[PDB]
Amino acid sequence: SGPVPSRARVYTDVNTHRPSEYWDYESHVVEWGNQDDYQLVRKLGRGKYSEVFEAINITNNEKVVVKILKPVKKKKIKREIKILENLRGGPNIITLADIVKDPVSRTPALVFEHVNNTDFKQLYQTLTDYDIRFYMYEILKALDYCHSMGIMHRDVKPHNVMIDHEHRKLRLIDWGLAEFYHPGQEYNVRVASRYFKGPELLVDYQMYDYSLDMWSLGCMLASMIFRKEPFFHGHDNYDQLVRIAKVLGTEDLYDYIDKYNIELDPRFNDILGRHSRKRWERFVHSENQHLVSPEALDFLDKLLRYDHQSRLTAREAMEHPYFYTVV
Ligand SMILES: O=P(O)(O)O[C@H]1[C@H](OP(=O)(O)O)[C@@H](OP(=O)(O)O)[C@H](OP(=O)(O)O)[C@@H](OP(=O)(O)O)[C@H]1OP(=O)(O)O
Numbered sequence: 333s334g335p336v337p338s339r340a341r342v343y344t345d346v347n348t349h350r351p352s353e354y355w356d357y358e359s360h361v362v363e364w365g366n367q368d369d370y371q372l373v374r375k376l377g378r379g380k381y382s383e384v385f386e387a388i389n390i391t392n393n394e395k396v397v398v399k400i401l402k403p404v405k406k407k408k409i410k411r412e413i414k415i416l417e418n419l420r421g422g423p424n425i426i427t428l429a430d431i432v433k434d435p436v437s438r439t440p441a442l443v444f445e446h447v448n449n450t451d452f453k454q455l456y457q458t459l460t461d462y463d464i465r466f467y468m469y470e471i472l473k474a475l476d477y478c479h480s481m482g483i484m485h486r487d488v489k490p491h492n493v494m495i496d497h498e499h500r501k502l503r504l505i506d507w508g509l510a511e512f513y514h515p516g517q518e519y520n521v522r523v524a525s526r527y528f529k530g531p532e533l534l535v536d537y538q539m540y541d542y543s544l545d546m547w548s549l550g551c552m553l554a555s556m557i558f559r560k561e562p563f564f565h566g567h568d569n570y571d572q573l574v575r576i577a578k579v580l581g582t583e584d585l586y587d588y589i590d591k592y593n594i595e596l597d598p599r600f601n602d603i604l605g606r607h608s609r610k611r612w613e614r615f616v617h618s619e620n621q622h623l624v625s626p627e628a629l630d631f632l633d634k635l636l637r638y639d640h641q642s643r644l645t646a647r648e649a650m651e652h653p654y655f656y657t658v659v
């Protein structure tokens with residue numbers, strides 16, 4: 333009779349009870365300001381979807397970030413703007429300061445608050461056990477908030493988490509793949525970045541929810557406490573599920589598929605194999621043992637579960653004993 337339906341265990345009907353103005357991004361009217369107020373300083377990054385620059389707001393001599401958007405569907409631009417406007421001011425959510433267009437190019441550009449980020453490839457190696465607990469709690473404040481606002485980020489990964497370590501400031505950025513949650517909606521599974529994709533996306537289970545972000549957060553946590561980046565290192569989307577099954581095992585994978593009556597794609601036939609569940613303690617080594625604890629492993633175990641419904645919600649995660657030592 334097809335795959336079994338599913339819905340979020342929390343904030344299930346938040347968009348249903350809100351007027352269409354909130355979630356109907358296609359009908360949202362965007363007012364594009366003049367980019368002449370911003371002087372570009374340097375390239376900060378690029379991305380599948382944009383060229384980002386450090387800039388000065390010439391009216392107040394303040395550093396900002398200008399994200400000049402690459403040629404994609406105008407529907408996607410409107411979605412990112414609406415979500416950023418909806419979440420603006422939320423805890424650890426990047427602040428959209430302005431929406432502008434350069435007068436001659438007319439290229440859509442988003443203006444954000446500047447975060448003096450240290451690339452994760454240089455920063456994660458220097459973090460202490462306390463710092464990992466602290467920054468994970470900061471991401472959880474952002475996720476509990478955006479999930480309460482009926483929004484799934486769908487691209488949680490180190491490159492999308494800006495950290496000003498000197499000021500202990502964290503911002504969740506890149507809301508370009510984010511979507512409104514509507515119970516029963518079948519979403520595109522071609523979201524998130526390979527290493528952080530939840531098993532729901534990999535087995536083409538479309539009725540997913542906020543819990544996808546919790547799998548991605550678990551992938552980040554595992555890479556930080558075990559110093560293994562990325563933790564699940566797939567070479568393609570099918571191999572990504574095989575990397576997961578080499579850790580969580582194939583028995584619990586088949587239980588997940590059966591609970592939701594999912595049909596595994598034939599491409600999995602020759603590559604999945606049979607794998608026993610590996611204990612989390614097997615990833616502890618001399619280089620990472622100072623970041624691992626029974627609380628850390630228990631918390632990781634409750635995030636990295638095939639069954640999206642069994643995973644901790646962001647609010648449940650915030651109540652975990654792993655966070656007792658944080659503010
Ligand atoms: O640092 P390298 O010698 O280049 O190897 C590493 C790493 O571990 P090793 O250092 O011990 O080889 C990973 O695997 P493990 O050995 O930890 O199992 C490995 O492979 P997987 O992630 O495929 O297991 C990974 O990536 P790959 O060989 O896929 O490129 C590769 O890292 P680099 O790609 O960064 O060199």
Ligand SMILES: Nc1ncnc2c1ncn2[C@@H]1O[C@H](COP(=O)(O)OP(=O)(O)O)[C@@H](O)[C@H]1O
Nearest residue numbers: 377379380381382384397444445446447506508
């Ligand atoms: N607010 C910011 N502060 C500092 N750097 C940023 C900021 N926003 C983006 N960047 C840099 O630009 C990159 C791409 O931005 P992002 O919004 O993530 O674009 P894309 O969706 O194209 O990947 C980031 O990974 C980061 O290095």
Ligand SMILES: [Mg+2]
Nearest residue numbers: 379491492506
């Ligand atoms: Mg990005």
